[PDB]
Point group: D3
Chain length 315, copies 6
């Protein structure tokens, strides 16, 4: 009697109210083992905004997802209870207020023992999530991104942008930098002083160039080595992908990962102790016929299958 | 306590699960006095398909709607119980099966005494609705369209298309042709007498040219004259609008009605015995940044205000 | 037996090889009384190019046209022999060569006594057409445009652009300026007297502001007064329309004519001695879901109805 | 010697670095009498953001503008010194900081005696402009909008959004409500009395319905009556236009003003004591082939012609 | 005196009536050795329709194709007689009527000994084609697709959708399942009971994952091994390609084949006994600036070169 | 005191007048060591025009570029003086007049000893550039393209189109064919007589197929071998890339290079004696959300870093 998506043999995929994976909507985190949550918030965006619309369009395109993973044969909704937990509370005018409200929501989700699978929103959304999930013990992370997002300040003394969240997370003791690995980093930078913080912290950084030199299998091996057997969060910024696969994103950088490579890397994360995940920076105003929304919905499903297994083991 | 849309003061319009007008979702028609219903079905389409996606995108853009009509000051959710009844069952592969399923759904809606406000879907969807709502007593209708939709058959012995529903309705005694008025008709025609049926059964047809000659107010008076005080349905085909206002439709014809005009006309229908309405032929695959979906949602809100008064006897 | 478009009762409008109006294709002008011709040429364009693609997309969207005008009840294909004459030869690299080739083609068309209905292409295409059709006796013209297109030269000693064809035509005695009327002119101008030429040679210029003051009917009467009973050409530049109706054009100017207005105006030209017409400046690379291509095809059909009466003496 | 746009006779409109009207760029307000300024800021936006990109795209499309108004025959660059003053400093992350920075910039502009013609940015940008221009003596205003923008607070204790700037302005004594007129207001409203503030402080509000009843000329007379001979600012929110003319905006409402109407209205404001103007809410991420950016550039040119007369005492 | 495309040295590619490859139009199959046919029909579509417009836009974009293949140096129009045979008769309202009418057309094409090179339309179009071409002897097939299209029933007892054609073809004895190989299969499924029919039938299924493990050369070798020297049809569903290359399609699945990989695989089919081919599921309402139309037109040309050689040998 | 881009820590990237890389605008070539120049000219275009708009949209998207290359750590603006030199004079109506005017501009740039980094415009723009830069001594070239652009005549006796420039350049003695290597060539051709001129001239032609067989490293090695230590120009036609990465181009050919591969190949050109470069055939009317403009701006930056080093050594 787990929640199940609308039956596509009966209700065609273009029909029905568009919730994540066409699952039932829930308001109580305790009703679920994995909560699918939107965080429609782009207050942290320094360049092209629009990620506030990401969760709606990912919900929409997630109608194309089916019940069973074709490689792993994981059937997430049979394994555990999955539901659309709605959207976190957000304030488009007041960044500090949104940070507070978002964390408060995730504290409730966490207190119910529910694993969050979240759709942004820009990458600043991951900070208040980590504030909830990393409050008692620090998290490890596999982070897919064109950017490290460990900047310090923007336009004066503003410590909170989509480019600072993991620096903040490390400073706040929420993210363990030795169990952090970043994959796909590329594109022009401000100074040769960017990798300073990463080196100081011991973060493993696999730039696009090194990802290409290693190939998928060896990259994966290095990633799993870094995070080991500890509590691990997966954060997927769609701008890790080449703009050809993910045009709808605020800060594109050419020469990126393919959707195929992203699926292979995420699938190889199976078995880890995964305590949450997100798919961020889908930006519908820059998207093309919902391409990036569909990439987001699909990576969300790939991640759901793995979180279902973790939630199943801990139960 | 009446259903209410999400509070835009606490939940921004880009957020929240996108139901019609961000209202709560309902499975039981008995729960509501006005039922907001999707009919995602375009099996009747003879040219450009895509209206099957219409309800989803109209739902999406209906997030932009607020609580009070700024002219009439009608607050519909306060007046009656409104909600998102979901979508009528549909079958994209079997045309006759869809017809059966939709009618079955609308009979449940009708039996609970709920007035339907529906979003298509192509125009053929109005027939199974009429098979439920006109079953006991025939309907009058204010019909906004570039096309009469009173054709007989297509590509052979095919009697059900988006171009024939109101001929079938008249034949089936569901719709009274003497109480039917069609506004906006225009564009080239297949044969020299396309409207033989319409003239012979007494339908009042206000072509685009005549509506232009008459103007909004006169056009409005003629329409209210035709439907009188009887039970009346309003069917809004977005292709009545010029393609500049409604690009997202299967059968565009240039030289059409403005959105402003559509709003003045529908607003002028206040006070009638409105038993139901629909907005049909929104085709997202042909739409431009959701413009037509927003037109659809807005016309839906205009009609919802009228229907809310009707439901409140 | 007259050429006929594909039967939409047996072949849906999305199907069949896309000729103009889905008519048969012809190589021989002698075969036809009205020749539907593409001039895919934009060598005259000084800003945004792309009108070279216009004829292909207008052909595409002309599939939506049916057999009978719904107002005038003209059935053009029954009246006269109509077909798709293909495209005039063009050279995208050599401007003077294109001018030569197009004129040569149009002289063949003219010598067979066939009336041309042409789709551009930028406005410069009308000149080589006029070099054929106005060779023996000068033309009058009803010209719909945001721009007068009577400039002298561009970027130096360049006398042929989409902005100069009707000055050249007047200079070459192909076009009678006393029988020329231009409707819709608007938008900022290069220099304080852009229309020195026009006022001095006696062209009647109805700016957008005046057309607004006058209205359709008065504007129509003035236009028919100017051209009288003489042989008259109709040249429709889609940029006469507001960008909302015709986004797909090289030189847009806001605050323009509606599609409805364009149709009323052209329809009012019934009964004149029409010797030819064109629809120019459709630029698909700037178009939105084929909106402007459809405007182009539809205006083409409106003009085809008039030309069919003319060809039928 | 007055700044001049690039010569389109020698440099085509698709070429050259894209400054406003292809004018030279300036760092010093003292250099100019009319300053063309970008305010790329949308921190006030409660729904769809993207107006931060507005100035760049309006700059881009302003390349299509020429030197002389074709109706009034005003040649603005000849009358006064005009140029591209660049963009006001902005901070996309810190709302109050942006407010401070923009006001500081506009005080420099004001102190040099330069009249600002600004391109937003969402409507909240007008407040810091008013904090500079209405500092010494209060402004009157002709305000074109679908919305009154006189709300009190959003999502809690937040007093600065694109929906509150003119309430703040009135509260701060920067704007005289008895000399304020708002034209085009329409669309559903949050609560039954959205315009309590407006009626109580004496703002003249011309809803879309009334503007339709009155017509352009009467609407124009009423507006000039309200502002009189006092110092007057003109604020043009592109969402006043129907989405068909201005799709690229954050808060569209259907049934709006045509571009033609917007031009007639602004043109009718000639002769007033105009101390500044802006065009706001152009949102390129929602725009269609730059249509709204071109509307923005064109309305900017219309306003620049008026402001050039004002600056020339 | 074979038909030849409009001469581009004389008539620029944006001009002229847009027939397939700008060839002359034909009404009599007997006039041709290879017939280029549109099947503008998407009655079988269960999700996003629009493939009914595919043949028109593929005709349009096929204007960009030239006369000679740059690798193989095949010049198809010199080798054999090629022409635009127009569109098969279709009924957008009545699926069963379209099936009848389409097969009737292809029976005529087949009776004239003409090899069909067809543009859909959704994949259900391949069924009536096989009903004509496989009527005396069964066909082998190389099938490029994200989906097996061997489903049984949809929404009750409807046996005909774009997802059932090859199951129908096998049941009807038109397609020999031991000489069938499917390449590119990927994406979430309904149950782990999908590959049941394929295993029962002996179809060789090369999922996307296995295509990646093998690489192009070995995949090709396996494909040629399966079909051997027997009569073989090639059916190309553009959704085999990643949405980055083919956005205009009804049922996209991320992480697909590249256009480059598709060209290499098709070229390696040279020499086989190819008796027809199609390019299906181009859906213009979801296409972006005609990208997928051009991919369709180009694969059509790649396939034409190979069919020309087969038609040349059999003559 | 070199010119520097607008400081993004102070002026967000969506703001400020959009010059190349947001640098200051210059009118005097002598003020600069590397000049960034637009050539908004598509008179040579035989098919889909629109490249006349390329320089404007590349300027626009170049706002996303940062100050330092993340691999090479070249900081071009610190190394040498870089500026936006505006656009070359162009005449959209008169091809021969544009050729004259464009060359006259580049003669001035060259006379000041400034290295040009140019954005087209279609590929015919490279001819008048070579007329200026190759006037005293011939140039070598690394040329990335789907097409050789060594055709002879079009539509009669027109020797100047975007498809003839390098034939003209060789005939005029401006380009040394033995130090010319072309990479990415693919797509149907007119006759098997296309590679005639290339073979006669000794041009090294690395077709797409051979690029795939060699891989990036070996291709690069072959390219550097061809041009050796001599004066070398890099000309990058964005249609070398698959339409998935560069949709906005006049003459697309499917199955092309990835943006990632293009970056790797260009980076491997470091150390050569580079005397100019261009990025041509960006066509905004066929572009999708400025994707190709951004690819153009990024390749422009990749090339700038290398030209900065050459300009630094020669100073
Ligand atoms: Mn990130
Ligand atoms: Mn990122
Ligand atoms: Mn209808
Ligand atoms: Mn209709
Ligand atoms: Mn013109
Ligand atoms: Mn014009
Ligand atoms: Mn406003
Ligand atoms: Mn507004
Ligand atoms: Mn398939
Ligand atoms: Mn498939
Ligand atoms: Mn090239
Ligand atoms: Mn090329």
């Amino acid at each position: 009697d787990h929640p199940q998506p609308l039956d596509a043999a009966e209700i065609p995929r273009f029909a029905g109210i568009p919730t994540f994976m066409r699952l039932p909507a829930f308001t109580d985190p305790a009703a679920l083992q994995v909560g699918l949550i939107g965080v429609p918030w782009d207050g942290g965006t320094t360049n092209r905004a629009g990620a506030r619309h990401g969760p709606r369009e990912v919900r929409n395109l997630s109608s194309l997802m089916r019940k069973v993973h074709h490689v792993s044969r994981i059937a997430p909704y049979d394994l555990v209870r999955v539901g659309d937990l709605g959207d976190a509370p957000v304030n488009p005018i007041d960044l500090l207020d949104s940070l507070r409200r978002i964390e408060g929501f995730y504290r409730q989700v966490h207190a119910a023992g529910t694993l969050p699978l979240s759709v942004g929103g820009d990458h600043l959304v991951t900070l208040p999530i980590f504030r909830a999930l990393g409050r008692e013990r620090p998290l490890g992370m596999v982070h897919f991104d064109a950017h490290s997002d460990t900047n310090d300040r923007y336009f004066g003394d503003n410590p909170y942008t989509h480019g600072t969240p993991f620096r903040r997370a490390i400073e706040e003791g929420l993210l363990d930098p030795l169990r952090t690995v970043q994959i796909g980093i590329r594109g022009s930078v401000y100074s040769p002083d960017d990798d300073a913080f990463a080196r100081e912290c011991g973060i493993r950084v696999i730039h696009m160039e090194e990802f290409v030199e290693l190939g998928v299998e060896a990259t994966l091996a290095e990633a799993r080595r870094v995070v080991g057997a500890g509590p691990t969060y997966v954060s997927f910024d769609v701008d890790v992908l080449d703009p050809a696969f993910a045009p709808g994103t605020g800060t594109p950088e050419i020469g990126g990962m393919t959707s195929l490579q992203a699926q292979q890397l995420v699938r190889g994360l199976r078995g880890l102790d995964l305590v949450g995940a997100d798919v961020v920076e889908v930006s519908p105003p820059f998207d093309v016929g919902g391409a990036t929304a569909l990439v987001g919905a699909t990576m969300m499903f790939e991640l759901l299958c793995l979180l279902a297994e973790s939630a199943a083991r801990s139960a």
